[PDB]
Amino acid sequence: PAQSVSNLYNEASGFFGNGKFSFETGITYARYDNLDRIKADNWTLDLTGRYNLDNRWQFDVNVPVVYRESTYQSGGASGGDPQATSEESVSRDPTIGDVNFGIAYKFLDESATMPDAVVSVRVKAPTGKEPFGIKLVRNDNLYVPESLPTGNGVWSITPGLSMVKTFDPAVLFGSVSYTHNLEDSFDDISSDVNQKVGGKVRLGDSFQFGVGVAFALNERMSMSFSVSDLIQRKSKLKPDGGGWQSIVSSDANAGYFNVGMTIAASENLTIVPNLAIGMTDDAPDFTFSLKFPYYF
Amino acid sequence: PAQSVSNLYNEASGFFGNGKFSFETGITYARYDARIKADNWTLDLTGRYNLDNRWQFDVNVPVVYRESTYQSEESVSRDPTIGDVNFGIAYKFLDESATMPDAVVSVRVKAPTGKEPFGIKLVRYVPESLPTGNGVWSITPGLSMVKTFDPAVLFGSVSYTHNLEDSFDDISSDVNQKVGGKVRLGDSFQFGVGVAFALNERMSMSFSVSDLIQRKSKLKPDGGGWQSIVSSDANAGYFNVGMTIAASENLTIVPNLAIGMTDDAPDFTFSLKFPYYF
Amino acid sequence: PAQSVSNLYNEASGFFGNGKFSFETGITYARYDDRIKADNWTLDLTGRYNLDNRWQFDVNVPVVYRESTYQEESVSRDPTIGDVNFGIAYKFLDESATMPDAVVSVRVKAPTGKEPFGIKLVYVPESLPTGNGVWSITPGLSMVKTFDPAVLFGSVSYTHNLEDSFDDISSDVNQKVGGKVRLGDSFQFGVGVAFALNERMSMSFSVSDLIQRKSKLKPDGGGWQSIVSSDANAGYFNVGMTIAASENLTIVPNLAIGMTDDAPDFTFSLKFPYYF
Ligand SMILES: CCCCCCCCOCCOCCOCCOCCO
Ligand SMILES: CCCCCCCCOCCOCCOCCOCCO
Ligand SMILES: CCCCCCCCCCCC[N+](C)(C)[O-]
Ligand SMILES: CCCCCCCCCCCC[N+](C)(C)[O-]
Ligand SMILES: CCCCCCCCCCCC[N+](C)(C)[O-]
Ligand SMILES: CCCCCCCCCCCC[N+](C)(C)[O-]
Ligand SMILES: CCCCCCCCCCCC[N+](C)(C)[O-]
Ligand SMILES: CCCCCCCCCCCC[N+](C)(C)[O-]
Ligand code: NA
Ligand code: NA
Ligand code: NA
């Protein structure tokens, strides 16, 4: 099996079957863009360890490290004039996000009739800086966060399914997953500087799926085209002594079109560049990533 | 031969020569965001008859399911209802040779069978219902061209939609008023260009772009002169990535992604079509 | 080397090393969308002298036609130049088994287009600009290498804008304010992959991103102040082809999808490089 084919399957399935222990370093850049303008430059360094057992089971742990920069622009401004200034920027120095781990089980091996199929579960912990309690600090009509979050503040569990099959030369693949967020509590759920309100949060659950095609171009390179869509239900807050109330407009549909490659730098090292184009306003405008899975 | 080649030509030309009588079941999902979020599904039912690889006759019945959500949130929906029924005649006037392209000329007649937008009232403010068609007759002559330059298959198409003037009992969306009036929906010009590839015996892949340009629409209330609706013009651009997959010798699966490039296009459109050859 | 391969390299590198002289005619349409819709056409005229597949000298004259509609009133610019520019390029690495084709270049752009500063709001602009009003110098790097059948390529450049002055920096019809302007510098890069499909055709997929720093103004008798929201990130996804019409004439269609709000929705272009 050519390296390109192996690397392709790893990328499409999330199941790294060539080896035994592997470590992937990833760098990702993502770009986002009372009436005010927010521009965000977000970098994520991903550190992922994987153990593949007999091409059947896989265990992984991922530690994301988040660097962020948001710029807030008002047109308040200076003072009361609907089209004047105003620029405030806020940043987060490199900090851990939400640590997570996954178990995957390959329940179908590809044959003439069957796909490679992998079932998986992913458990994510709330280790990142949560968004709840972050205060908006007041130019007169421009309020800006005192800090930026690096995670969503809750535990979550994500069972998933991946399928891959070669119809030479096209490799078709698809995937689907469901994220259940666990309810949790916080000392402060208010972003009012003047107040402190304890409360609980239920983050809306989400459904994710993707399909795509990939090609092995030569011994060392593959290319991939895919689409994906994430659908998130609205989120709810319960202040102490209050009831559950939904946050209007917290629901989301984040669609992406992805073009990527796999490049075998050696037997052990792959370079995986990818572009994800945001198709909806809930997605970043675009996302560039470069991943370096290394096999040992 | 190969199936992939046939299926791709069908896709690129709109002329299905597989091929005598065929029935195509299509499912389409389209996503819009204005605050209004729209999830729109269309089940397409299309019958086609290809006569001697020269003439093609078809009827299409679209069935529309819609959910719009309005955020202060209130939601409005349309249960599965028929849209604008239409039929088409196509004539292949050039057959592909070393020098010639496959070229098809066509006309499509669309009837106002869907629930029209004109009576629909804004109720304290969301619509009481969602339309399923545009409320007018339209006629669309079109042109398609396809040619293989091995292994690239280049294609392009162009069409013009003339909308017929029509009259309605109510043109107003004010709940308190009823105003009869006439409507001229702005005509539109559509074109696209692309490239496709046969990957193997059974599969093709396609990349294309298209753009629709619609002129302004006009209203005449009873008594009453013609007024342009100054913001009714549109430019809807799309980038398409698609496949054809020969499931058997009778069934093709056609997945397509259309990415909206402009604000008048849905954010994205996913479709899955299943042409079946009897 | 097949014509497709040559045309491919020319497109990816900007270095047209298969002839002494070339002239490229390009037509570009771009679409942008109180509401404003803009239809913008640019006719590009570019002459190149390639010396021994080692050096290249070029001049580009863009001719700009523009139409903006404000919602309804419309404003237009009849065909007018163009920030004229020229470039010098040097191929410092020739592709071998180990090395890429690599070209270093410098591009000098002059402020010949109608500048935006001083254009009055009358509410709609009285006119539309065709250039940015300043000199700029852009050193750049291009790299291309075949890993059969994939041709990988990439490019990167930095634009330094020269400070300049204008008689009027205000768009207020009632005022005239002289001032100096430092246009924010920019960093540009792209990467992509291309394929020779046959003797005569190639296809390309690429991405690019332009990052522009904020600009600053000094009105006369005032101090330097940064122009909020003048910073920009214009990202593009490109799908393109090269088609050999003759051994001299290539047709180059390209679609550039804007990925950010600082980019046009989309850009369709058609370029016709001609080797003499
Ligand atoms: C970039 C979007 C391109 C679409 C990706 C294709 C995968 C999604 O398709 C869903 C249905 O496909 C099932 C394929 O079934 C195989 C049939 O072939 C059997 C005969 O050889
Ligand atoms: C996303 C795609 C971007 C670039 C696609 C450009 C496609 C250029 O194709 C033009 C289409 O024209 C179709 C006609 O083909 C037949 C040519 O007829 C000439 C006879 O030799
Ligand atoms: C750029 C981030 C995209 C997020 C949307 C997710 C799309 C596909 C979801 C299924 C993933 C399942 N998998 C491969 C983990 O098993
Ligand atoms: C993983 C490859 C990353 C590609 C490089 C993208 C650079 C984006 C830089 C944005 C931040 C710079 N700036 C000027 C806004 O400060
Ligand atoms: C995806 C929505 C497309 C809307 C605009 C389409 C422009 C195509 C013009 C003529 C169509 C002929 N064709 C390709 C169907 O054979
Ligand atoms: C040549 C055959 C053309 C297709 C004919 C299909 C009839 C449509 C019946 C579907 C009914 C839909 N609905 C939901 C309103 O009940
Ligand atoms: C309104 C018409 C709807 C479509 C007509 C479908 C007819 C079903 C025929 C089933 C038998 C087909 N076959 C090839 C398996 O024999
Ligand atoms: C046409 C839009 C401009 C966007 C800026 C980014 C362009 C990156 C590609 C530069 C190509 C340079 N060169 C010398 C290789 O041709
Ligand atoms: Na959107
Ligand atoms: Na737009
Ligand atoms: Na944007």
PDB file of all heavy atoms in Angstrom, chain A residues 167-169 213 227 229 234 249 251 253 257 279-281, chain B residues 31 35 37 71 73 199-200 203 243 257 259 267-268 270:
ATOM      1  N   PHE A 167     -12.703   3.158  -4.472  1.00  0.00           N
ATOM      2  CA  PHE A 167     -13.316   2.777  -5.759  1.00  0.00           C
ATOM      3  C   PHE A 167     -12.351   3.322  -6.776  1.00  0.00           C
ATOM      4  O   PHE A 167     -12.531   4.447  -7.252  1.00  0.00           O
ATOM      5  CB  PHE A 167     -14.687   3.436  -5.940  1.00  0.00           C
ATOM      6  CG  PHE A 167     -15.703   3.014  -4.935  1.00  0.00           C
ATOM      7  CD1 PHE A 167     -15.863   3.717  -3.744  1.00  0.00           C
ATOM      8  CD2 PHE A 167     -16.522   1.911  -5.164  1.00  0.00           C
ATOM      9  CE1 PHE A 167     -16.820   3.336  -2.793  1.00  0.00           C
ATOM     10  CE2 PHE A 167     -17.474   1.510  -4.208  1.00  0.00           C
ATOM     11  CZ  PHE A 167     -17.625   2.229  -3.024  1.00  0.00           C
ATOM     12  N   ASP A 168     -11.300   2.555  -7.047  1.00  0.00           N
ATOM     13  CA  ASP A 168     -10.054   3.074  -7.674  1.00  0.00           C
ATOM     14  C   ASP A 168     -10.288   3.953  -8.893  1.00  0.00           C
ATOM     15  O   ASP A 168     -11.000   3.518  -9.817  1.00  0.00           O
ATOM     16  CB  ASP A 168      -9.142   1.920  -8.069  1.00  0.00           C
ATOM     17  CG  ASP A 168      -7.736   2.385  -8.400  1.00  0.00           C
ATOM     18  OD1 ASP A 168      -7.117   3.045  -7.534  1.00  0.00           O
ATOM     19  OD2 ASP A 168      -7.250   2.076  -9.505  1.00  0.00           O
ATOM     20  N   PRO A 169      -9.755   5.177  -8.956  1.00  0.00           N
ATOM     21  CA  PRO A 169      -8.868   5.846  -8.009  1.00  0.00           C
ATOM     22  C   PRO A 169      -9.531   6.741  -6.941  1.00  0.00           C
ATOM     23  O   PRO A 169      -8.830   7.424  -6.197  1.00  0.00           O
ATOM     24  CB  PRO A 169      -8.060   6.755  -8.951  1.00  0.00           C
ATOM     25  CG  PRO A 169      -9.077   7.203  -9.972  1.00  0.00           C
ATOM     26  CD  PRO A 169     -10.069   6.073 -10.095  1.00  0.00           C
ATOM     27  N   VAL A 213     -14.193  13.190  -1.064  1.00  0.00           N
ATOM     28  CA  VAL A 213     -13.460  12.314  -1.979  1.00  0.00           C
ATOM     29  C   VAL A 213     -12.046  12.668  -1.850  1.00  0.00           C
ATOM     30  O   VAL A 213     -11.743  13.840  -1.839  1.00  0.00           O
ATOM     31  CB  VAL A 213     -13.596  12.622  -3.507  1.00  0.00           C
ATOM     32  CG1 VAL A 213     -13.554  11.345  -4.341  1.00  0.00           C
ATOM     33  CG2 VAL A 213     -14.828  13.439  -3.783  1.00  0.00           C
ATOM     34  N   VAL A 227     -16.840  18.278   2.249  1.00  0.00           N
ATOM     35  CA  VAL A 227     -17.748  19.264   2.784  1.00  0.00           C
ATOM     36  C   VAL A 227     -18.157  18.778   4.164  1.00  0.00           C
ATOM     37  O   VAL A 227     -18.235  17.589   4.407  1.00  0.00           O
ATOM     38  CB  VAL A 227     -18.969  19.504   1.879  1.00  0.00           C
ATOM     39  CG1 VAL A 227     -19.802  18.235   1.673  1.00  0.00           C
ATOM     40  CG2 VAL A 227     -19.825  20.630   2.418  1.00  0.00           C
ATOM     41  N   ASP A 229     -20.821  19.951   7.750  1.00  0.00           N
ATOM     42  CA  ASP A 229     -21.784  20.837   8.408  1.00  0.00           C
ATOM     43  C   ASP A 229     -22.002  20.463   9.871  1.00  0.00           C
ATOM     44  O   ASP A 229     -22.237  19.306  10.184  1.00  0.00           O
ATOM     45  CB  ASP A 229     -23.118  20.808   7.673  1.00  0.00           C
ATOM     46  CG  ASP A 229     -23.981  22.015   7.978  1.00  0.00           C
ATOM     47  OD1 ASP A 229     -23.454  23.131   8.211  1.00  0.00           O
ATOM     48  OD2 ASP A 229     -25.216  21.845   7.987  1.00  0.00           O
ATOM     49  N   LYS A 234     -29.716  25.554  20.450  1.00  0.00           N
ATOM     50  CA  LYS A 234     -29.549  26.722  21.314  1.00  0.00           C
ATOM     51  C   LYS A 234     -29.137  26.307  22.729  1.00  0.00           C
ATOM     52  O   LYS A 234     -29.348  25.163  23.191  1.00  0.00           O
ATOM     53  CB  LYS A 234     -30.671  27.780  21.211  1.00  0.00           C
ATOM     54  CG  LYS A 234     -32.069  27.387  21.568  1.00  0.00           C
ATOM     55  CD  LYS A 234     -33.041  28.521  21.192  1.00  0.00           C
ATOM     56  CE  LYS A 234     -34.449  28.215  21.734  1.00  0.00           C
ATOM     57  NZ  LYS A 234     -35.043  26.930  21.245  1.00  0.00           N
ATOM     58  N   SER A 249     -30.373  33.167  19.532  1.00  0.00           N
ATOM     59  CA  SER A 249     -29.290  33.285  18.605  1.00  0.00           C
ATOM     60  C   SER A 249     -28.026  32.530  19.030  1.00  0.00           C
ATOM     61  O   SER A 249     -26.986  32.754  18.459  1.00  0.00           O
ATOM     62  CB  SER A 249     -29.065  34.754  18.229  1.00  0.00           C
ATOM     63  OG  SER A 249     -30.206  35.266  17.540  1.00  0.00           O
ATOM     64  N   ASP A 251     -27.995  29.214  18.868  1.00  0.00           N
ATOM     65  CA  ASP A 251     -28.026  28.133  17.864  1.00  0.00           C
ATOM     66  C   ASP A 251     -27.110  28.493  16.698  1.00  0.00           C
ATOM     67  O   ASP A 251     -26.842  29.677  16.414  1.00  0.00           O
ATOM     68  CB  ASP A 251     -29.445  27.817  17.368  1.00  0.00           C
ATOM     69  CG  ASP A 251     -30.160  29.025  16.786  1.00  0.00           C
ATOM     70  OD1 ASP A 251     -30.492  29.954  17.571  1.00  0.00           O
ATOM     71  OD2 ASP A 251     -30.401  29.043  15.547  1.00  0.00           O
ATOM     72  N   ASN A 253     -25.311  27.033  12.726  1.00  0.00           N
ATOM     73  CA  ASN A 253     -25.015  26.146  11.606  1.00  0.00           C
ATOM     74  C   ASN A 253     -23.710  26.607  10.990  1.00  0.00           C
ATOM     75  O   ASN A 253     -23.658  27.668  10.388  1.00  0.00           O
ATOM     76  CB  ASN A 253     -26.105  26.144  10.548  1.00  0.00           C
ATOM     77  CG  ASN A 253     -25.829  25.122   9.452  1.00  0.00           C
ATOM     78  OD1 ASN A 253     -24.758  25.128   8.842  1.00  0.00           O
ATOM     79  ND2 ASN A 253     -26.773  24.218   9.230  1.00  0.00           N
ATOM     80  N   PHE A 257     -16.293  24.042   3.405  1.00  0.00           N
ATOM     81  CA  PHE A 257     -15.758  23.345   2.232  1.00  0.00           C
ATOM     82  C   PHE A 257     -14.238  23.189   2.391  1.00  0.00           C
ATOM     83  O   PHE A 257     -13.546  24.156   2.656  1.00  0.00           O
ATOM     84  CB  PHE A 257     -16.063  24.116   0.956  1.00  0.00           C
ATOM     85  CG  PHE A 257     -15.484  23.471  -0.273  1.00  0.00           C
ATOM     86  CD1 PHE A 257     -15.920  22.213  -0.692  1.00  0.00           C
ATOM     87  CD2 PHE A 257     -14.463  24.097  -0.988  1.00  0.00           C
ATOM     88  CE1 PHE A 257     -15.371  21.605  -1.794  1.00  0.00           C
ATOM     89  CE2 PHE A 257     -13.911  23.498  -2.097  1.00  0.00           C
ATOM     90  CZ  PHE A 257     -14.351  22.243  -2.496  1.00  0.00           C
ATOM     91  N   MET A 279     -18.602  28.484   4.964  1.00  0.00           N
ATOM     92  CA  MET A 279     -19.761  28.726   4.085  1.00  0.00           C
ATOM     93  C   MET A 279     -20.880  29.484   4.731  1.00  0.00           C
ATOM     94  O   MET A 279     -21.744  29.985   4.057  1.00  0.00           O
ATOM     95  CB  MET A 279     -20.299  27.391   3.615  1.00  0.00           C
ATOM     96  CG  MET A 279     -19.269  26.665   2.755  1.00  0.00           C
ATOM     97  SD  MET A 279     -19.992  25.052   1.901  1.00  0.00           S
ATOM     98  CE  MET A 279     -20.892  24.174   3.397  1.00  0.00           C
ATOM     99  N   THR A 280     -20.862  29.573   6.064  1.00  0.00           N
ATOM    100  CA  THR A 280     -21.911  30.269   6.844  1.00  0.00           C
ATOM    101  C   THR A 280     -21.265  31.298   7.764  1.00  0.00           C
ATOM    102  O   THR A 280     -20.063  31.221   8.042  1.00  0.00           O
ATOM    103  CB  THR A 280     -22.771  29.319   7.715  1.00  0.00           C
ATOM    104  OG1 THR A 280     -21.953  28.597   8.648  1.00  0.00           O
ATOM    105  CG2 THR A 280     -23.522  28.286   6.870  1.00  0.00           C
ATOM    106  N   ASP A 281     -22.075  32.222   8.278  1.00  0.00           N
ATOM    107  CA  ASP A 281     -21.596  33.248   9.212  1.00  0.00           C
ATOM    108  C   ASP A 281     -21.171  32.701  10.580  1.00  0.00           C
ATOM    109  O   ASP A 281     -20.551  33.404  11.309  1.00  0.00           O
ATOM    110  CB  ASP A 281     -22.653  34.336   9.458  1.00  0.00           C
ATOM    111  CG  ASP A 281     -22.891  35.243   8.239  1.00  0.00           C
ATOM    112  OD1 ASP A 281     -22.037  35.351   7.330  1.00  0.00           O
ATOM    113  OD2 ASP A 281     -23.975  35.856   8.184  1.00  0.00           O
TER     114      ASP A 281
ATOM    115  N   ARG B  31     -29.596  26.421   2.814  1.00  0.00           N
ATOM    116  CA  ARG B  31     -29.446  27.141   4.079  1.00  0.00           C
ATOM    117  C   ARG B  31     -29.271  28.650   3.802  1.00  0.00           C
ATOM    118  O   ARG B  31     -28.410  29.050   3.033  1.00  0.00           O
ATOM    119  CB  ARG B  31     -28.224  26.555   4.775  1.00  0.00           C
ATOM    120  CG  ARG B  31     -27.745  27.294   6.000  1.00  0.00           C
ATOM    121  CD  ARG B  31     -28.699  27.137   7.149  1.00  0.00           C
ATOM    122  NE  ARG B  31     -28.399  28.054   8.233  1.00  0.00           N
ATOM    123  CZ  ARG B  31     -29.063  28.062   9.389  1.00  0.00           C
ATOM    124  NH1 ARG B  31     -30.063  27.193   9.621  1.00  0.00           N
ATOM    125  NH2 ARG B  31     -28.722  28.932  10.327  1.00  0.00           N
ATOM    126  N   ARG B  35     -33.321  39.176  12.780  1.00  0.00           N
ATOM    127  CA  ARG B  35     -32.540  38.042  12.183  1.00  0.00           C
ATOM    128  C   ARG B  35     -33.313  36.769  11.706  1.00  0.00           C
ATOM    129  O   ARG B  35     -34.011  36.111  12.491  1.00  0.00           O
ATOM    130  CB  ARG B  35     -31.433  37.589  13.146  1.00  0.00           C
ATOM    131  CG  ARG B  35     -30.468  36.555  12.536  1.00  0.00           C
ATOM    132  CD  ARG B  35     -29.030  36.965  12.758  1.00  0.00           C
ATOM    133  NE  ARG B  35     -28.093  36.277  11.882  1.00  0.00           N
ATOM    134  CZ  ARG B  35     -26.837  36.674  11.711  1.00  0.00           C
ATOM    135  NH1 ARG B  35     -26.385  37.758  12.343  1.00  0.00           N
ATOM    136  NH2 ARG B  35     -26.034  35.998  10.905  1.00  0.00           N
ATOM    137  N   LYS B  37     -33.158  32.921   9.878  1.00  0.00           N
ATOM    138  CA  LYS B  37     -32.477  31.683   9.488  1.00  0.00           C
ATOM    139  C   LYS B  37     -33.505  30.796   8.777  1.00  0.00           C
ATOM    140  O   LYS B  37     -34.577  30.562   9.307  1.00  0.00           O
ATOM    141  CB  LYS B  37     -31.923  30.954  10.714  1.00  0.00           C
ATOM    142  CG  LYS B  37     -30.908  31.783  11.510  1.00  0.00           C
ATOM    143  CD  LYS B  37     -30.677  31.218  12.924  1.00  0.00           C
ATOM    144  CE  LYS B  37     -29.784  32.043  13.873  1.00  0.00           C
ATOM    145  NZ  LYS B  37     -28.347  31.658  13.842  1.00  0.00           N
ATOM    146  N   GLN B  71     -35.654  35.926  14.668  1.00  0.00           N
ATOM    147  CA  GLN B  71     -35.125  36.187  16.026  1.00  0.00           C
ATOM    148  C   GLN B  71     -35.252  37.668  16.442  1.00  0.00           C
ATOM    149  O   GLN B  71     -34.837  38.589  15.685  1.00  0.00           O
ATOM    150  CB  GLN B  71     -33.724  35.600  16.168  1.00  0.00           C
ATOM    151  CG  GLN B  71     -33.751  34.076  16.288  1.00  0.00           C
ATOM    152  CD  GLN B  71     -32.381  33.425  16.183  1.00  0.00           C
ATOM    153  OE1 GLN B  71     -31.367  34.097  15.902  1.00  0.00           O
ATOM    154  NE2 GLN B  71     -32.336  32.114  16.417  1.00  0.00           N
ATOM    155  N   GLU B  73     -37.459  34.827  19.828  1.00  0.00           N
ATOM    156  CA  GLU B  73     -37.571  34.211  18.496  1.00  0.00           C
ATOM    157  C   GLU B  73     -38.912  33.524  18.183  1.00  0.00           C
ATOM    158  O   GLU B  73     -39.492  32.833  19.022  1.00  0.00           O
ATOM    159  CB  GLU B  73     -36.435  33.170  18.264  1.00  0.00           C
ATOM    160  CG  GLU B  73     -36.686  31.700  18.603  1.00  0.00           C
ATOM    161  CD  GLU B  73     -35.439  30.850  18.340  1.00  0.00           C
ATOM    162  OE1 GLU B  73     -34.552  31.243  17.532  1.00  0.00           O
ATOM    163  OE2 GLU B  73     -35.323  29.774  18.943  1.00  0.00           O
ATOM    164  N   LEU B 199     -13.463   9.634 -13.692  1.00  0.00           N
ATOM    165  CA  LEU B 199     -12.420   9.112 -12.799  1.00  0.00           C
ATOM    166  C   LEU B 199     -12.186   7.633 -13.027  1.00  0.00           C
ATOM    167  O   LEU B 199     -11.061   7.133 -12.960  1.00  0.00           O
ATOM    168  CB  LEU B 199     -12.814   9.311 -11.341  1.00  0.00           C
ATOM    169  CG  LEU B 199     -13.224  10.715 -10.922  1.00  0.00           C
ATOM    170  CD1 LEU B 199     -13.743  10.686  -9.502  1.00  0.00           C
ATOM    171  CD2 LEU B 199     -12.024  11.643 -11.038  1.00  0.00           C
ATOM    172  N   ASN B 200     -13.271   6.927 -13.280  1.00  0.00           N
ATOM    173  CA  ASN B 200     -13.210   5.486 -13.577  1.00  0.00           C
ATOM    174  C   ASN B 200     -14.429   5.065 -14.398  1.00  0.00           C
ATOM    175  O   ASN B 200     -15.143   5.927 -14.917  1.00  0.00           O
ATOM    176  CB  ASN B 200     -13.013   4.671 -12.278  1.00  0.00           C
ATOM    177  CG  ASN B 200     -14.129   4.851 -11.255  1.00  0.00           C
ATOM    178  OD1 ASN B 200     -15.264   5.237 -11.571  1.00  0.00           O
ATOM    179  ND2 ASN B 200     -13.790   4.616 -10.007  1.00  0.00           N
ATOM    180  N   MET B 203     -17.562   6.502 -12.133  1.00  0.00           N
ATOM    181  CA  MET B 203     -17.596   7.808 -11.428  1.00  0.00           C
ATOM    182  C   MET B 203     -17.027   8.968 -12.187  1.00  0.00           C
ATOM    183  O   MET B 203     -16.025   8.849 -12.865  1.00  0.00           O
ATOM    184  CB  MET B 203     -16.875   7.720 -10.100  1.00  0.00           C
ATOM    185  CG  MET B 203     -17.405   6.561  -9.257  1.00  0.00           C
ATOM    186  SD  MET B 203     -16.456   6.467  -7.554  1.00  0.00           S
ATOM    187  CE  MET B 203     -17.581   5.132  -6.682  1.00  0.00           C
ATOM    188  N   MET B 243     -20.413  15.096  -8.085  1.00  0.00           N
ATOM    189  CA  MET B 243     -20.057  13.774  -8.650  1.00  0.00           C
ATOM    190  C   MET B 243     -21.244  13.117  -9.314  1.00  0.00           C
ATOM    191  O   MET B 243     -22.390  13.488  -9.092  1.00  0.00           O
ATOM    192  CB  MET B 243     -19.503  12.843  -7.590  1.00  0.00           C
ATOM    193  CG  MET B 243     -18.171  13.324  -7.053  1.00  0.00           C
ATOM    194  SD  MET B 243     -17.291  11.958  -5.930  1.00  0.00           S
ATOM    195  CE  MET B 243     -17.138  10.485  -7.248  1.00  0.00           C
ATOM    196  N   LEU B 257     -22.620  19.849  -4.219  1.00  0.00           N
ATOM    197  CA  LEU B 257     -22.502  21.005  -3.322  1.00  0.00           C
ATOM    198  C   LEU B 257     -22.431  22.297  -4.139  1.00  0.00           C
ATOM    199  O   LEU B 257     -21.565  22.435  -4.999  1.00  0.00           O
ATOM    200  CB  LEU B 257     -21.222  20.903  -2.497  1.00  0.00           C
ATOM    201  CG  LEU B 257     -20.785  22.147  -1.738  1.00  0.00           C
ATOM    202  CD1 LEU B 257     -21.810  22.495  -0.675  1.00  0.00           C
ATOM    203  CD2 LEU B 257     -19.424  21.944  -1.099  1.00  0.00           C
ATOM    204  N   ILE B 259     -21.860  26.193  -3.372  1.00  0.00           N
ATOM    205  CA  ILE B 259     -21.483  27.214  -2.397  1.00  0.00           C
ATOM    206  C   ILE B 259     -21.953  28.577  -2.885  1.00  0.00           C
ATOM    207  O   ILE B 259     -21.643  29.003  -4.002  1.00  0.00           O
ATOM    208  CB  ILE B 259     -19.971  27.235  -2.231  1.00  0.00           C
ATOM    209  CG1 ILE B 259     -19.504  25.857  -1.813  1.00  0.00           C
ATOM    210  CG2 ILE B 259     -19.569  28.245  -1.190  1.00  0.00           C
ATOM    211  CD1 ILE B 259     -18.002  25.716  -1.663  1.00  0.00           C
ATOM    212  N   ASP B 267     -26.371  30.322   1.520  1.00  0.00           N
ATOM    213  CA  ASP B 267     -25.026  30.022   2.005  1.00  0.00           C
ATOM    214  C   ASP B 267     -24.467  28.803   1.307  1.00  0.00           C
ATOM    215  O   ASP B 267     -23.376  28.842   0.771  1.00  0.00           O
ATOM    216  CB  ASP B 267     -25.025  29.768   3.516  1.00  0.00           C
ATOM    217  CG  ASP B 267     -25.228  31.014   4.317  1.00  0.00           C
ATOM    218  OD1 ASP B 267     -24.961  32.110   3.804  1.00  0.00           O
ATOM    219  OD2 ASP B 267     -25.645  30.917   5.481  1.00  0.00           O
ATOM    220  N   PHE B 268     -25.232  27.732   1.315  1.00  0.00           N
ATOM    221  CA  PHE B 268     -24.849  26.518   0.593  1.00  0.00           C
ATOM    222  C   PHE B 268     -26.085  25.702   0.273  1.00  0.00           C
ATOM    223  O   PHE B 268     -27.124  25.863   0.905  1.00  0.00           O
ATOM    224  CB  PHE B 268     -23.841  25.666   1.368  1.00  0.00           C
ATOM    225  CG  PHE B 268     -24.383  25.102   2.666  1.00  0.00           C
ATOM    226  CD1 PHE B 268     -24.998  23.849   2.711  1.00  0.00           C
ATOM    227  CD2 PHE B 268     -24.255  25.815   3.850  1.00  0.00           C
ATOM    228  CE1 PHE B 268     -25.460  23.322   3.925  1.00  0.00           C
ATOM    229  CE2 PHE B 268     -24.723  25.304   5.050  1.00  0.00           C
ATOM    230  CZ  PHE B 268     -25.331  24.053   5.098  1.00  0.00           C
ATOM    231  N   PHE B 270     -26.959  21.572  -0.629  1.00  0.00           N
ATOM    232  CA  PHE B 270     -26.577  20.153  -0.796  1.00  0.00           C
ATOM    233  C   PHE B 270     -27.685  19.504  -1.548  1.00  0.00           C
ATOM    234  O   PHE B 270     -28.814  19.603  -1.132  1.00  0.00           O
ATOM    235  CB  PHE B 270     -26.525  19.341   0.519  1.00  0.00           C
ATOM    236  CG  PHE B 270     -25.445  19.722   1.461  1.00  0.00           C
ATOM    237  CD1 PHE B 270     -25.697  19.767   2.848  1.00  0.00           C
ATOM    238  CD2 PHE B 270     -24.166  19.987   1.017  1.00  0.00           C
ATOM    239  CE1 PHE B 270     -24.694  20.101   3.763  1.00  0.00           C
ATOM    240  CE2 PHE B 270     -23.166  20.330   1.938  1.00  0.00           C
ATOM    241  CZ  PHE B 270     -23.427  20.389   3.307  1.00  0.00           C
TER     242      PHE B 270
END
